[PDB]
């Protein structure tokens, strides 16, 4: 009546068509298989925390965080430097303010520590 066509530039030079969608899925699965073949008994990814999303819109939702904290790791009963060797992602810049999020993470860490089998250095 509206329409805006951004074809005033030399658009025909930069046209990326993703024919390799099927090729790149295979490529990532081969990558995962290789990583799991090198990291044999371990999962494939670090233990990630539970986290509340920002903004009025999404604060209903609970999502994965980057890492726990020095606080959540200490309350679980271990050190940050040792947590990384057991494959627990640690976030130094994140803060602890909500009690429900805190306790959920501590129990996630505690249940993780019961389920694991750490190998000795010998």
């Amino acid at each position: 009546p509206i329409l805006k066509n951004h074809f005033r530039k030399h658009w025909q030079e930069r046209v990326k068509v993703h024919f390799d969608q099927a090729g790149k899925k295979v490529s990532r699965r081969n990558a995962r298989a290789t990583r799991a073949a090198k990291i044999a008994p371990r999962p494939l990814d670090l233990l990630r925390p539970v986290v509340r999303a920002p903004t009025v819109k999404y604060n209903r939702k609970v999502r994965a965080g980057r890492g726990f904290t020095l606080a959540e790791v200490k309350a679980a009963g271990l050190t940050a430097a040792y947590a990384r060797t057991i494959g627990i992602a640690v976030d130094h810049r994140r803060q602890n303010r909500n009690q429900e999020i805190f306790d959920a993470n501590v129990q996630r860490l505690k249940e993780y520590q019961s389920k694991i089998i750490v190998f000795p250095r010998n």
Binding site: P43, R48, A64
Partner: peptide, 8 residues
């Protein structure tokens, strides 16, 4: 350790 996208 994270719940996967997709269907198992």
């Amino acid at each position: 350790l994270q719940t996967p996208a997709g269907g198992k």
